[PDB]
Structure formats: structure tokens, C-alpha cells
Design a protein around this ligand. Structure first.
Ligand SMILES: Nc1nc2nc(C(=O)N[C@@H](Cc3ccc(O)cc3)C(=O)O)cnc2c(=O)[nH]1
Ligand SMILES: Nc1nc2nc(C(=O)N[C@@H](Cc3ccc(O)cc3)C(=O)O)cnc2c(=O)[nH]1
Length: 263
């Protein structure tokens, strides 16, 4: 029922990863909502359940597969399937809890984690912050295996949390930001794993605020500047949507777009 996008870390290249992220974005957004050349994800309000999720099937060189479920309203990884078991993060509300009952319905064993899936909680469980977790094709390859082996006792909870952190950034954050996609492309091109620099972290942390600022902007101009960080940690002030067009690929729906003003 829900659309499936396939990616493998086995012999992954810049092009195969680029194709993957493009395909994810195409299934996340409908094309209905584009503001200042930036697509907006579907509004949660009134969105039919048959349109709520996409599936990302990850394979690796170890010949293992896991399937991540992503909420189209926010690109959030809500859970995953590995073989005969599915695992869902603790839902943040009642209707998100109802929504996940529509996923992996044929699976033998259904589990809801007692913990939520936000970075704060996952970092706590991993025993490491995002700034100290390596990203790249190698980490993703290993993350797929770790997710796969969780149900049989092979994967410690900190490793599982770390693996989620890897998946979320290389899939969801890359889909949200061309900039983060670009950083992942670089790691793949050279087969060199590295932890995300402050430009990556601050973009991830600011996605909600950037989405709202763009959507509330006066003809693209922010009422309040947003402070980001560069690769070297130095401050970068954002005053306008214009500078974000090459950086942000998708926004979360925050408000209705204002009417055009006919001059
Ligand atoms: N499973 C899953 N989890 C996710 N979790 C986050 C996440 O935790 N974002 C943070 C950003 C933030 C962090 C710290 C701050 O001080 C401020 C903002 C937030 O909204 O709280 C983002 N994306 C996903 C995602 O796609 N899938
Ligand atoms: N399906 C689903 N969605 C969820 N979405 C959030 C969440 O943080 N939502 C934000 C949107 C947002 C997302 C990522 C960010 O980095 C920043 C903002 C909000 O409601 O404003 C937390 N949990 C869940 C969850 O369990 N299940």
C-alpha cells in the first residue's frame, strides 16, 4: 500500500545515494505546496491514513535488509521492520499512536519502545551526542546490521540508539536539507566516515524554526534573524529565505500560505 524506496550501502556511490534521496523527497512531497521555491511537506490536518507513510528499505553488503517507516508530514522515522519483528518509537500523541497501527500489519511480533525517537532521548541511550557519532557509508552499513540483529539479542541498546541516529541523519536529514545530503555525498565519494560538524548539527536543530520563519516571512524577509553555525563553528545569521534556497530542500507545514498581494 505505502510506497517503498530501496537503497543499499553495498557498492553505494554519490549517484546511487543522490538518486535515493531524490526518490525519498518525491514520495514525501506532493508538489502542491512550494513557497519561495522550497517545497512544504503535507499538512497533518485532514491527511488520509492511506497517504501518511513511506517505506525506506535499506539493504547492505552483509545481505541484510531493514525497512524504515517515515511519516510524510515531517520525514520522522517512526519505526522499523526486520524480518518477523517491528519496533516503533513511543508515539508523541494519540493520533500518531493510531497511525502506526497501519504499518507492518502482517508482521508476527509488534513492539512499541518505551522511549521516544527524538535525538535527545537517542543520544542519552547511545551514550554519545550526534557530534561524536560518525556518519557515512560504513556507519550506515553497520547500522543496518545492528537494526537487523536487535530482536535476537545481538545488538546492545546503546548500539541500537547510535544506529537510529545514523539512519535518521543519512535519510531524513539529508531529505530535509540539500546541504546535509551534500555532506553525506562527500563521505560516500571518499569512503571516509566522520561525525557531523556544527553546520550539520545547527541545521538539524533549526529545521522547525527555519520552516516557521520562511512560512511567516514578509515576502521572504524574516522578522527575527536565525543564528546558524558554519563548518568551523563560527556564527552565520539568516535574515531571508533567499540564502536558504540551496540549503533547505523540504519544510514542515507550519501555517497556511498568505494571499499574494497584487501590486
Ligand atoms: N526518529 C526520528 N527522530 C528525529 N528526531 C529529531 C530531533 O530530535 N530533532 C530535534 C532538533 C533539536 C534538538 C535539540 C535542540 O536543542 C533543538 C532542536 C527536536 O525537534 O527536538 C529530528 N528528526 C527525527 C527523525 O527524522 N526521526
Ligand atoms: N510521526 C511522528 N512524528 C513526531 N514528530 C515529532 C516532532 O518533533 N515533531 C515536530 C516537527 C519537527 C520534526 C523534526 C524536527 O527536527 C523539528 C520539528 C512538531 O510537532 O513541531 C516528535 N515525535 C514524533 C513521533 O513520535 N511520531
Amino acid at each position: 500500500q505505502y510506497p517503498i524506496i530501496n537503497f543499499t550501502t553495498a557498492g553505494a556511490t554519490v549517484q546511487s545515494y543522490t538518486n535515493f534521496i531524490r526518490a525519498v523527497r518525491g514520495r514525501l512531497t506532493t508538489g502542491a505546496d512550494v513557497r519561495h521555491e522550497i517545497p512544504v511537506l503535507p499538512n497533518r490536518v485532514g491527511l488520509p491514513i492511506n497517504q501518511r507513510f513511506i517505506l525506506v528499505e535499506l539493504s547492505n553488503h552483509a545481505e541484510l535488509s531493514v525497512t524504515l517507516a517515515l511519516d510524510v508530514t515531517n520525514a520522522y522515522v517512526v519505526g522499523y521492520r526486520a524480518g518477523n519483528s517491528a519496533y516503533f518509537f513511543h508515539p508523541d500523541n494519540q493520533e500518531d499512536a493510531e497511525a502506526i497501527t497501519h504499518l507492518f500489519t502482517d508482521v508476527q511480533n509488534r513492539y512499541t519502545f518505551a522511549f521516544g525517537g527524538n535525538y535527545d532521548r537517542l543520544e542519552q541511550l547511545a551514550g554519545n551526542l550526534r557530534e561524536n557519532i560518525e556518519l557515512g557509508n560504513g556507519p550506515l552499513e553497520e547500522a543496518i546490521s545492528a537494526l537487523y540483529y536487535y530482536s535476537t539479542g545481538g545488538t546492545q541498546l546503546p548500539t541500537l540508539a547510535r544506529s537510529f541516529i545514523i539512519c535518521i541523519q543519512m535519510i531524513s536529514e539529508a531529505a530535509r536539507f540539500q546541504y546535509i545530503e551534500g555532506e553525506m555525498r562527500t563521505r560516500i565519494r571518499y569512503n571516509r566516515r566522520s561525525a557531523p560538524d556544527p553546520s550539520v548539527i545547527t541545521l538539524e536543530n533549526s529545521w522547525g524554526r527555519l520552516s516557521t520563519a520562511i512560512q511567516e516571512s514578509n515576502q521572504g524577509a524574516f522578522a527575527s534573524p536565525i543564528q546558524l553555525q558554519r563548518r568551523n563553528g563560527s556564527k552565520f545569521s539568516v535574515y531571508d529565505v533567499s540564502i536558504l534556497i540551496p540549503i533547505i530542500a523540504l519544510m514542515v507545514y507550519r501555517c497556511a500560505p498568505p494571499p499574494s498581494s497584487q501590486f
